[PDB]
Amino acid sequence: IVGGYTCGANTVPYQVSLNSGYHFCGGSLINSQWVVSAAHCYKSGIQVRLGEDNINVVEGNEQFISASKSIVHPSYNSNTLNNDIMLIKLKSAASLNSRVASISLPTSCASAGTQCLISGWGNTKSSGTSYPDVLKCLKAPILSDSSCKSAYPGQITSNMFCAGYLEGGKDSCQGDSGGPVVCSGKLQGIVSWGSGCAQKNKPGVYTKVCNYVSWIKQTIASN
Ligand SMILES: *[B]([O])([O])[C]([C]C1=[C]C(C#N)=[C][C]=[C]1)[N]C(=O)[C]1[C][C][C]N1C(=O)[C]([N])[C]C1=[C][C]=[C][C]=[C]1
Ligand SMILES: [Ca+2]
The domains located in the chain, with CATH, are 1-12+103-210 (2.40.10.10), 13-102+211-223 (2.40.10.10)
Evaluate: CB of 194 within 6 angstroms of ligand 1. yes
C-alpha–C-alpha distance, residues 150 and 145, integer Å: 9
Within 10 A of 108 (CB to CB), how many other CB atoms are there?
A: 10
C-alpha–C-alpha distance, residues 210 and 204, integer Å: 18
- Cα distances (angstroms) measured from residue 142 to each of 12, 116, 160, 188, 204: 19, 7, 11, 10, 10
Give the nearest ligand 1 atom to 80 CA.
30
Residue minimizing CA distance to atom 32 of ligand 1: 193
For 52-179, where are the E strands, in sequence order? 63-72, 86-90, 115-120, 136-141, 160-163
C-alpha–C-alpha distance, residues 196 and 35, integer Å: 27
Of 165, 193, 200, 202, best ligand 1 pocket probe by most atoms within 8 Å of the beta carbon: 193
Way it was determined? X-ray
Q: Which residues pair with 218 in a beta bridge?
A: none
The answer to whether 177 and 27 are in contact (CB under 8 A) is no
Contacts of 216 (CB under 8 A, 6+ apart): 30, 36, 87, 105
Q: Cα of 84 to ligand 1 centre, how many Å?
A: 11
Length of the chain: 223
C-alpha–C-alpha distance, residues 49 and 65, integer Å: 7
Q: Give yes or no: 84 in active site.
A: yes
Instruction: Name the strand (E) or helix (H) holding 20.
Output: none
**3 state DSSP class of 217:** helix
Q: Cα of 49 to ligand 2 centre, how many Å?
A: 9
Nearest partner of 38 among 5, 96, 77, judged by Cα = 77
Q: Which residues pair with 67 in a beta bridge?
A: 90
Q: Cα of 212 to ligand 1 centre, how many Å?
A: 21
- Cα distances (angstroms) measured from residue 32 to each of 14, 92, 96, 184: 10, 8, 7, 21
CA triple 60-61-64, angle to 5 deg:
100
C-alpha–C-alpha distance, residues 44 and 61, integer Å: 25
Q: Cα of 194 to ligand 1 centre, how many Å?
A: 5
Evaluate: CB of 201 within 6 angstroms of ligand 1. no
The answer to whether 206 and 189 are in contact (CB under 8 A) is yes
Q: Name the binding residues.
A: 52, 54, 57, 62, 171-172, 174-175, 177
C-alpha–C-alpha distance, residues 7 and 1, integer Å: 11
Nearest partner of 1 among 116, 98, 113, judged by Cα = 116
Nearest partner of 140 among 193, 82, 198, 54, judged by Cα = 198
Sheet holding 136-141, edge to edge: 5-6, 136-141, 115-120, 180-183, 186-193, 204-208, 160-163
Nearest partner of 126 among 174, 194, 197, judged by Cα = 197
